[PDB]
Amino acid sequence: DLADLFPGFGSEWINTSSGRIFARVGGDGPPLLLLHGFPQTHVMWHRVAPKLAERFKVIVADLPGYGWSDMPESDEQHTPYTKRAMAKQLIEAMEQLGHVHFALAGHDRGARVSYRLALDSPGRLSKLAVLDILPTYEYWQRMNRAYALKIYHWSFLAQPAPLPENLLGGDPDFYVKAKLASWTRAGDLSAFDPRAVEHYRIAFADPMRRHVMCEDYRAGAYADFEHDKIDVEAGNKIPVPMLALWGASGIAQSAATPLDVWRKWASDVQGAPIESGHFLPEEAPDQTAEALVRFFS
């Protein structure tokens, strides 16, 4: 029932100290790690990874706790699902492949892992691409009526268990599809490959998977914010050359482009809007792929 959307990619279960990371691996050349976000899995890269795999060893991983990666036991502080912890786990996973210095592109939650990784261990990264995020700190700092309605799920999923878990169980299929549709330029699922939607839907149908996503968001409200706040206050910038791509209808320039935001977080950032909703690699795969290839090569 689950299509293989990365023909010619191998499938690796990468052991780490916190559990297995699942990854599709293809290509040859410099290693490039691609991290999806919510509510998706690695298959969201299915339209762009083949193009990346022309020039790179492309590692398309499920985030810890997402997709087919193992789900580490969480704790009161949601530690394993803090971006610091997920970055540490993915660094460990890349080390199991002998990749200690790699390029990194993350979308959504994966991009939050990615810039936290860049902040915590910039020596691991040759280049960083983040797709359609601002740092978690920025979202919370920007919090106002408009953002609270737009990213209500940041506060909804951060509610204490089991409130979101129980509500999500009310109609998980609807919810994951609603999230997918509502953040696209189209407003429907037509930008997505149906077989990828089935990947997302099946992952979301697992209550334990949904709980992990809530743990991720709870981290996003608490530890991840605090971690970012320390960096803002210390003036710590990302020293890795980075590319920030955003959907022109994701979250753009009401009073500051993402580029102006990322410049405060990174010393070397280039940016471009992509004609897309949130799901750049699926809504605008050619435009995301060429931007990524141009940047990483």
Added chain:
Amino acid sequence: DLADLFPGFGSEWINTSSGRIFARVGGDGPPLLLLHGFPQTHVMWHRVAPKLAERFKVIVADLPGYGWSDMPESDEQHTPYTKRAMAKQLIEAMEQLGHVHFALAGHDRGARVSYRLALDSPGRLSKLAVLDILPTYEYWQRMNRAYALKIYHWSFLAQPAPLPENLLGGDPDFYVKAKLASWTRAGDLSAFDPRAVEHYRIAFADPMRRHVMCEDYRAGAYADFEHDKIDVEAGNKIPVPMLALWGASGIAQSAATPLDVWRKWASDVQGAPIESGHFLPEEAPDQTAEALVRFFS
């Protein structure tokens, strides 16, 4: 079978242009309208209404669309569930009883109706009490990270239909009990009369009632905020003598000091904290009733 929590009170089905308002009616003396909020019905006054009914003609109304009141069909602007519309409907309902000048105490959503009533139609009110609220404008204006996590439901229930409705429908009992419990001081259902809880749960079990509550919150995020915004930016103050009561562990006190906020909205406001969570009339019936008797007398 639902309990009668208002022994001696009559029951009135009041016709209005926007549907019938259900109300319990007891007492004698000056008319006093009591409005409940979310996720409650008029029965949350059942501990304080009989005390009030010694001194006042107490009309304990279900909000439009709540309890046993009719549910006007909403529209794209959530118009019947805007506090302005509900206020107008309750003015009509009161006019049906011959009450064109009355005292008004509202809690939660009902308090939002109440202060909007006082802004739109102050000549209708002898005195106004609002329980555990600040104006909707103020909640939205103070919606930073901490407050967005505290009252996430303001943004979650305001999401476009049928997203909240679909999630709420899986286990409505859980959600209504979770909100009742989470906003009390004790954090459980022990403040509530079990028979009252059953009223609330039964109303919440109706998907149309749930939809109405979301419409209320949708109005709260849009039209209500806009109406409030116009008044605050115009410096329109409530001229009706006002009592602002709030729970020391309630919702209003976590955004800001309530009396300071209310003094910006009201030319003649007194305030007192009550040791209580959000549900002042059920958590602190004696203190609430005494505060209301003293103020309205």
